[PDB]
Enzyme design. Structure first.
Site, mmCIF file in Angstrom:
data_model
loop_
_atom_site.group_PDB
_atom_site.id
_atom_site.type_symbol
_atom_site.label_atom_id
_atom_site.label_comp_id
_atom_site.label_asym_id
_atom_site.label_seq_id
_atom_site.Cartn_x
_atom_site.Cartn_y
_atom_site.Cartn_z
ATOM 1 N N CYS A 111 13.159 -61.594 -18.980
ATOM 2 C CA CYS A 111 13.027 -62.969 -19.479
ATOM 3 C C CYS A 111 13.278 -63.987 -18.368
ATOM 4 C CB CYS A 111 13.955 -63.202 -20.666
ATOM 5 S SG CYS A 111 13.511 -62.270 -22.163
ATOM 6 N N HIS B 28 16.260 -69.693 -25.018
ATOM 7 C CA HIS B 28 16.906 -68.664 -25.830
ATOM 8 C C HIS B 28 18.116 -68.017 -25.134
ATOM 9 C CE1 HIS B 28 15.659 -64.955 -23.929
ATOM 10 N NE2 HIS B 28 14.367 -65.266 -23.981
ATOM 11 N N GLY C 235 15.790 -57.947 -19.935
ATOM 12 C CA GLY C 235 16.328 -58.585 -18.739
ATOM 13 C C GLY C 235 15.261 -59.250 -17.880
#
Ligand SMILES: O=C(N[C@@H](C(=O)Nc1cncc2ccccc12)c1cccc(Cl)c1)[C@@H]1CC[C@H](C(=O)N2CCCC2)O1
Ligand SMILES: [Cl-]
Lengths: 305, 297
Positions: free
Chosen positions: B137, B41, B135
């Site tokens: 991820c 993503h 942030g």
């Protein structure tokens, strides 16, 4: 979202852990630059423990009596000295993995990460707080002596604790990295007991602000309190007195949530009186006191839900 | 003595964390050998979005060093960025897929920089109750066996309830989740029964015995009770796995099940177990044995 008891990444400390052996005793040491710091009780014998004279035991030792092992490499000891309850072993090799560091002495209520080690090998990392009675509720077994407590704010490791002993109640006692014990403890197997412990009030308040930040307000009420009235109630539940310094320190969280410190104190007073009534706060059914105001600001978002 | 939620030492994983930037999105990557793994993503029809990208669109940073991307491919929900430099700090590792109930350590990172380590469990509803901000991820979950790091989780998203969802390191999601902005919800969660039992044995080992009784139960009667309290069924495998702790404490697994049955029907009565007023389910039988034995890495 979420709120966990979070420890600092332990890598910078792992690269400093060594094994120190003196005779039949083995424990952990902290290798920083060309010095290995470890509990001075490594020089004791099975009898010494009750009334050891460390200066008399140390004078009988030579450098080659101390065996220091870093991984699979033997470090050569070229000097030794005692500073309070810590033994400092001068070695012939500076640690190439030495991080940027400071030795800091913390006050009760402060939190830190602990890298628990056995035979100079790290086994686990956990977060904990210096209790008001100067003990720590750690998880340690025999051989964990010399394990260290630290904070890593920015890229500097601040060493604040070195493990020395377990008390009869299962709690732990130790020193700062200059060998000064936290609390009225001695490195002797004499009858020593932790004083009555209390709840860190400023930390419980901080954790209640963290719950409001993450979207929970069920515990708030329409009341306020004077600081004096709050302390009269808090002392009856074995809570530490809340000082004006604590109120000042909670200022940023008060401004972020819109809840005055003395209004959050009124909600705490009511929680002590009523309990939780089957409800939880941040996944806990007890009032949590091992997160400081600084830890809450570090872990939680800057935007209230 | 003592019982804490303990994480594995994170050093071997810290040396693999990098920052991956694509356009306006910045998240974390895992640099192992000459490949950087990160949530896809960072770039929806992912094949169509990826075909429009070149190697120079992906900016990878390891500390203050820029890594040059020389290739890219997708494996399920993970993006694999071939880089020009092999990570010299690559530990011995495996990619493993864990089952619900199993625990792992999470190294939470922001901008490729590790900020904290915590222990958690894969819930029966496949979510994790983590602590993550925007942030995070690309942060990873792992276990350690001797010198080998077994990577089991990569963070992808937060659900509306505040719980987290992600994939194994091969990009397969844990749970019925998809990596996109849409109406997704965690299913009703259950308590990991085998883990609560293990934690009750840890309490007995640490001297907490007030909850023990003279009674026993059949496995069937226990499961009829446990189904009523949203507890996962206890299987014969779980009973076998609790064997060592049963032998160490002298309390048979079905004997400990009758104690848990009484705790579920009557509560704690103002008492705590290991400093907790709730029944703790994020310590496996192996975690209890390891912490109450001193295994090192
Ligand atoms: O209890 C012992 N050691 C210390 C200690 O408290 N260690 C521990 C720390 N944390 C958790 C523990 C859990 C379970 C058992 C021990 C634990 C200890 C005792 C008294 C005073 C001091 Cl400063 C240190 C035993 C008995 C003497 C032996 C020892 O340390 N020797 C030194 C040289 C000759 C042998 O190990
Ligand atoms: Cl302090």
């Amino acid at each position: 979202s979420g709120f966990r008891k979070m420890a600092f990444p332990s890598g910078k400390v792992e690269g400093c852990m060594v094994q120190v052996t003196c005779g039949t005793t083995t424990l952990n040491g902290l290798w920083l630059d060309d010095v290995v710091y470890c509990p001075r009780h490594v020089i004791c014998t099975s009898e010494d423990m009750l009334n050891p004279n460390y200066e008399d035991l140390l004078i009988r030792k030579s450098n080659h009596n101390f065996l220091v092992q870093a991984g699979n490499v033997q470090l050569r000891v070229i000097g030794h000295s005692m500073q309070n309850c810590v033994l400092k072993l001068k070695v012939d090799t500076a640690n190439p993995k030495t991080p940027k560091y400071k030795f800091v002495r913390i006050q009760p209520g402060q939190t830190f990460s602990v890298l628990a080690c056995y035979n100079g090998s790290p086994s686990g990392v956990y977060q904990c707080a210096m209790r008001p009675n100067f003990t720590i509720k750690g998880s340690f077994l025999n051989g964990s002596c010399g394990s260290v407590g630290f904070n890593i704010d920015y890229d500097c490791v601040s060493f604040c604790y070195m493990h020395h002993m377990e008390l009869p109640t299962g709690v732990h006692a130790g020193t700062d990295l200059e060998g000064n014990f936290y609390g009225p403890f001695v490195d002797r197997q004499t009858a020593q007991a932790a004083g009555t412990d209390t709840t860190i009030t400023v930390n419980v308040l901080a954790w209640l602000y963290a719950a409001v930040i993450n979207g929970d307000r069920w515990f708030l009420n329409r009341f306020t309190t004077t600081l004096n009235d709050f302390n009269l109630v808090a002392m009856k539940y074995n809570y530490e007195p809340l000082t004006q310094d604590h109120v000042d320190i909670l200022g940023p969280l008060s401004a972020q949530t819109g809840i005055a410190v003395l209004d959050m104190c009124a909600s705490l007073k009511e929680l002590l009186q009523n309990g939780m009534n089957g409800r939880t706060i941040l996944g806990s059914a007890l009032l949590e006191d091992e997160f400081t105001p600084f830890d809450v600001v570090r872990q939680c978002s800057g935007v209230t839900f």
